[PDB]
Protein backbone atom coordinates (compact mmCIF):
# COMPACT_ATOMS: atom_id res chain seq x y z
CA UNK A 1 0.00 0.00 0.00
CA UNK A 2 3.15 2.17 0.30
CA UNK A 3 3.77 2.93 -3.70
CA UNK A 4 6.98 1.76 -5.14
CA UNK A 5 9.27 3.15 -6.31
CA UNK A 6 9.55 4.70 -2.59
CA UNK A 7 11.44 7.07 -1.85
CA UNK A 8 12.34 7.19 2.12
CA UNK A 9 14.63 10.15 3.26
CA UNK A 10 17.68 9.17 5.86
CA UNK A 11 18.21 12.62 7.44
CA UNK A 12 21.22 13.67 7.86
CA UNK A 13 22.39 10.42 6.36
CA UNK A 14 23.03 6.80 8.04
CA UNK A 15 25.08 6.53 11.36
CA UNK A 16 26.43 3.15 13.28
CA UNK A 17 23.55 1.88 15.10
CA UNK A 18 20.73 2.77 12.58
CA UNK A 19 18.67 0.13 11.57
CA UNK A 20 16.40 0.57 9.01
CA UNK A 21 13.04 -1.64 8.81
CA UNK A 22 11.37 -2.58 5.57
CA UNK A 23 8.29 -4.79 5.61
CA UNK A 24 6.79 -5.96 2.36
CA UNK A 25 5.27 -9.09 0.57
CA UNK A 26 6.75 -10.21 -2.79
CA UNK A 27 4.68 -10.23 -6.11
CA UNK A 28 3.86 -13.85 -7.39
CA UNK A 29 5.93 -13.55 -10.46
CA UNK A 30 9.12 -11.59 -9.21
CA UNK A 31 11.72 -10.78 -11.03
CA UNK A 32 13.65 -7.93 -8.98
CA UNK A 33 13.78 -6.20 -5.81
CA UNK A 34 16.03 -3.30 -5.11
CA UNK A 35 17.47 -1.10 -2.13
CA UNK A 36 19.17 1.64 -3.44
CA UNK A 37 21.07 3.90 -0.31
CA UNK A 38 22.08 6.86 -2.40
CA UNK A 39 24.32 9.73 -2.02
CA UNK A 40 23.31 12.02 -4.34
CA UNK A 41 23.43 10.36 -7.47
CA UNK A 42 25.93 7.99 -6.08
CA UNK A 43 24.36 4.46 -4.97
CA UNK A 44 26.16 3.67 -1.56
CA UNK A 45 25.07 0.67 -1.19
CA UNK A 46 23.02 -1.35 -3.63
CA UNK A 47 21.20 -4.43 -2.93
CA UNK A 48 19.56 -6.65 -5.26
CA UNK A 49 17.66 -9.80 -5.10
CA UNK A 50 17.03 -11.32 -8.60
CA UNK A 51 14.67 -14.08 -9.08
CA UNK A 52 16.02 -15.37 -12.24
CA UNK A 53 19.22 -14.56 -13.58
CA UNK A 54 19.83 -17.37 -16.02
CA UNK A 55 17.52 -19.22 -14.16
CA UNK A 56 18.74 -18.96 -10.59
CA UNK A 57 18.35 -16.89 -7.42
CA UNK A 58 20.91 -14.64 -6.65
CA UNK A 59 21.69 -11.53 -4.79
CA UNK A 60 24.09 -9.00 -6.39
CA UNK A 61 25.23 -6.05 -4.03
CA UNK A 62 27.55 -3.05 -5.26
CA UNK A 63 28.36 0.40 -5.46
CA UNK A 64 27.65 3.11 -8.13
CA UNK A 65 30.24 6.27 -8.54
CA UNK A 66 29.86 8.88 -11.15
CA UNK A 67 26.99 6.45 -12.73
CA UNK A 68 29.36 3.55 -13.07
CA UNK A 69 28.84 0.12 -11.52
CA UNK A 70 31.51 -1.36 -9.40
CA UNK A 71 32.84 -4.67 -8.73
CA UNK A 72 29.55 -6.97 -7.76
CA UNK A 73 29.14 -9.22 -4.37
CA UNK A 74 27.00 -11.86 -4.79
CA UNK A 75 25.67 -14.12 -2.15
CA UNK A 76 24.05 -17.43 -3.32
CA UNK A 77 21.26 -17.89 -0.17
CA UNK A 78 18.33 -16.49 -1.02
CA UNK A 79 15.46 -15.92 1.28
CA UNK A 80 13.16 -14.24 -0.46
CA UNK A 81 10.19 -15.99 -2.05
CA UNK A 82 7.56 -15.25 -4.91
CA UNK A 83 4.56 -14.21 -2.94
CA UNK A 84 5.65 -14.32 0.78
CA UNK A 85 5.65 -11.34 3.36
CA UNK A 86 9.12 -10.18 4.32
CA UNK A 87 11.59 -8.24 6.60
CA UNK A 88 14.74 -6.80 5.41
CA UNK A 89 16.62 -5.07 8.49
CA UNK A 90 19.23 -3.03 7.77
CA UNK A 91 21.46 -2.74 10.78
CA UNK A 92 24.91 0.16 9.79
CA UNK A 93 27.79 -0.85 11.81
CA UNK A 94 30.43 0.76 11.79
CA UNK A 95 32.24 -0.87 8.92
CA UNK A 96 29.22 -2.09 6.93
CA UNK A 97 25.96 -2.54 6.29
CA UNK A 98 24.55 -5.95 8.00
CA UNK A 99 21.25 -7.16 6.53
CA UNK A 100 19.09 -10.04 7.86
CA UNK A 101 15.69 -11.13 6.21
CA UNK A 102 13.02 -12.58 7.98
CA UNK A 103 15.21 -12.34 11.25
CA UNK A 104 18.35 -14.52 9.87
CA UNK A 105 21.43 -12.34 9.23
CA UNK A 106 22.14 -12.79 5.56
CA UNK A 107 25.10 -10.21 4.40
CA UNK A 108 27.22 -7.43 5.31
CA UNK A 109 28.89 -5.06 2.34
CA UNK A 110 31.75 -2.90 3.62
CA UNK A 111 31.88 0.86 3.13
CA UNK A 112 32.88 2.03 0.01
CA UNK A 113 31.24 5.40 0.42
CA UNK A 114 32.51 6.66 3.58
CA UNK A 115 31.03 9.97 3.79
CA UNK A 116 28.07 8.02 5.98
CA UNK A 117 25.91 11.25 6.99
CA UNK A 118 25.62 11.79 3.24
CA UNK A 119 23.78 8.90 2.52
CA UNK A 120 20.72 10.66 3.03
CA UNK A 121 18.24 8.75 0.68
CA UNK A 122 16.70 4.68 0.54
CA UNK A 123 15.11 4.02 -2.32
CA UNK A 124 13.00 1.02 -2.45
CA UNK A 125 11.50 -0.79 -5.78
CA UNK A 126 11.21 -3.59 -7.58
CA UNK A 127 8.19 -6.46 -7.39
CA UNK A 128 6.68 -6.31 -4.04
CA UNK A 129 3.69 -4.41 -2.01
CA UNK A 130 5.52 -2.05 0.08
CA UNK A 131 3.77 -2.21 3.98
CA UNK A 132 6.25 0.07 5.63
CA UNK A 133 9.69 1.75 5.70
CA UNK A 134 11.13 3.11 8.87
CA UNK A 135 14.02 3.34 10.61
CA UNK A 136 15.34 3.82 14.38
CA UNK A 137 18.89 4.47 16.37
CA UNK A 138 19.30 0.91 18.65
C1 LIG B 1 16.12 -4.07 -14.24
O1 LIG B 1 15.68 -2.89 -13.66
C2 LIG B 1 16.47 -1.95 -13.18
C3 LIG B 1 15.94 -0.87 -12.67
C4 LIG B 1 16.70 0.12 -12.17
C5 LIG B 1 18.01 -0.05 -12.12
C6 LIG B 1 18.56 -1.16 -12.58
C7 LIG B 1 20.01 -1.37 -12.45
O2 LIG B 1 20.78 -0.42 -12.66
N1 LIG B 1 20.48 -2.60 -12.39
C8 LIG B 1 21.87 -2.91 -12.60
C9 LIG B 1 22.53 -3.20 -11.27
O3 LIG B 1 21.82 -4.23 -10.57
C10 LIG B 1 23.95 -3.65 -11.50
C11 LIG B 1 24.70 -4.06 -10.24
O4 LIG B 1 26.03 -4.44 -10.52
O5 LIG B 1 23.97 -4.83 -12.35
C12 LIG B 1 23.43 -4.57 -13.65
S1 LIG B 1 23.54 -6.11 -14.58
C13 LIG B 1 25.22 -6.48 -14.56
O6 LIG B 1 25.78 -6.13 -15.85
C14 LIG B 1 27.21 -6.25 -15.87
C15 LIG B 1 27.68 -5.85 -17.29
O7 LIG B 1 27.39 -4.46 -17.41
C16 LIG B 1 27.65 -7.66 -15.61
O8 LIG B 1 27.13 -8.51 -16.65
C17 LIG B 1 27.10 -8.13 -14.26
N2 LIG B 1 27.51 -9.44 -13.86
C18 LIG B 1 28.58 -9.64 -13.10
O9 LIG B 1 29.35 -8.70 -12.75
C19 LIG B 1 28.86 -10.99 -12.48
C20 LIG B 1 29.84 -11.01 -11.47
C21 LIG B 1 30.15 -12.19 -10.81
C22 LIG B 1 29.49 -13.36 -11.23
C23 LIG B 1 28.54 -13.32 -12.21
O10 LIG B 1 27.88 -14.49 -12.49
C24 LIG B 1 26.81 -14.75 -13.32
C25 LIG B 1 28.19 -12.18 -12.86
C26 LIG B 1 25.57 -7.93 -14.26
O11 LIG B 1 25.05 -8.21 -12.96
C27 LIG B 1 22.02 -4.09 -13.55
O12 LIG B 1 21.55 -3.73 -14.87
C28 LIG B 1 17.78 -2.11 -13.16
Not at 69 to 89: A, D, L, M, T, Y
Not at 98 to 110: E, R
Not at 114 to 129: F, H, P, Y
Request: hydrophobic fraction near 40%; aromatic fraction near 8%.
Amino acid sequence: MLIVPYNLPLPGGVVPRMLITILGTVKPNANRIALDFQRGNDVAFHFNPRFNENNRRVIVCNTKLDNNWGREERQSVFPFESGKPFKIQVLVEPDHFKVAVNDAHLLQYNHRVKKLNEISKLGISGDIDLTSASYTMI
